[PDB]
Amino acid sequence: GALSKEILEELQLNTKFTEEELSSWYQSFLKEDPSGRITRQEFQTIYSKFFPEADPKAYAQHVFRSFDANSDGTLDFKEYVIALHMTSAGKTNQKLEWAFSLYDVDGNGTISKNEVLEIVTAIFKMISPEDTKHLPEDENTPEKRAEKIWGFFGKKDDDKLTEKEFIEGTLANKEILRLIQFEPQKVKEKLK
Ligand SMILES: [Ca+2]
Numbered sequence: 001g002a003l004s005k006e007i008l009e010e011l012q013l014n015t016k017f018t019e020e021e022l023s024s025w026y027q028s029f030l031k032e033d034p035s036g037r038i039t040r041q042e043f044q045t046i047y048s049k050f051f052p053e054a055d056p057k058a059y060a061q062h063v064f065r066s067f068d069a070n071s072d073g074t075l076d077f078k079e080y081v082i083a084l085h086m087t088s089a090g091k092t093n094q095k096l097e098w099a100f101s102l103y104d105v106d107g108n109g110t111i112s113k114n115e116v117l118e119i120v121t122a123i124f125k126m127i128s129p130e131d132t133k134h135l136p137e138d139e140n141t142p143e144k145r146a147e148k149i150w151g152f153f154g155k156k157d158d159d160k161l162t163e164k165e166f167i168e169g170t171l172a173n174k175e176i177l178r179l180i181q182f183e184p185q186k187v188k189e190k191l192k
Contacts, residue, residue, distance in 0.1 A: 007078045014090045017081075026077050037074035040064045043083070051126060051184065058122035062102060063087060069107025092181055096170050100163045102182060110160035117146040119182070126184040127191075134191045145179050152176045 004022035008015055017025065030036060040061060047060035063086065065071060067079045075083065086098050101107075105115040121142040124132075132140060139145050153161055153169055153176070169176045181187050 003077055007081050010078070011082060011085055014085055014094055016085065016089050022081065025081070029077055029080075036077055038080055039074050040071055043075060043080070053128040053130075054184070055125040059126055062105065062119060062122050065105070066098065066102045069105075087183055088185070092177060092183060092186060093171065096167050097163075099170065099180065099182065100166050103166070103180070110162055111166060112160060113146070113150050113155065113157055116149050116161075117142060120146040120149070120179075123182050123184075123187065127187060131188055131191055139179065149176060149179045152179070 001023060003026065004019040007017075007022055008019060026036075033042070043064050044057055044060040047056040047063075061071065063083050064075065066086075067075060067083070082098075086095055086102075092099075100111070103111045103115055103119050105118055124142045124145070127135075139148060152173055153165065155161060170180060171177075178190060181190070
């Protein structure tokens, strides 16, 4: 029941659901997954089903990991609902702390150049083959996009990017926001 309250607590104005609606979704969730827990592979299946034009396995794995920096174990209903909101609802700039957790692949508290490339590659694979030709030349491969992000942050190859700086840059430089953007529809849309 009151798992819905803590979901609302953590999404706040990001929510697309009332407490009653979340409880309804939860009861349906329990019919299909009675433990109230979903594994990474079950989570990946949701994205595979709903992004048929793409190759969403890596993306879904990184989103799952954003909760804990762990590929093992499960998400509960709260984390599952929050995950779907992060990928698919609301405004990117209301998600910046979560975005830091997405990009900090190993969970060590800072983002490295390789981590940016890993996440940018996973997001890139969410784009349909048809759409990637609308990409600007200097943003049309994962390497180009990740290096542009790293350059906008003023970083050398072995530098570390902190949460403070990530939040600042993603707020202030709209090119950084556009390039780190992780919601597939928003990448698609801005492209078009
Ligand atoms: Ca890291």
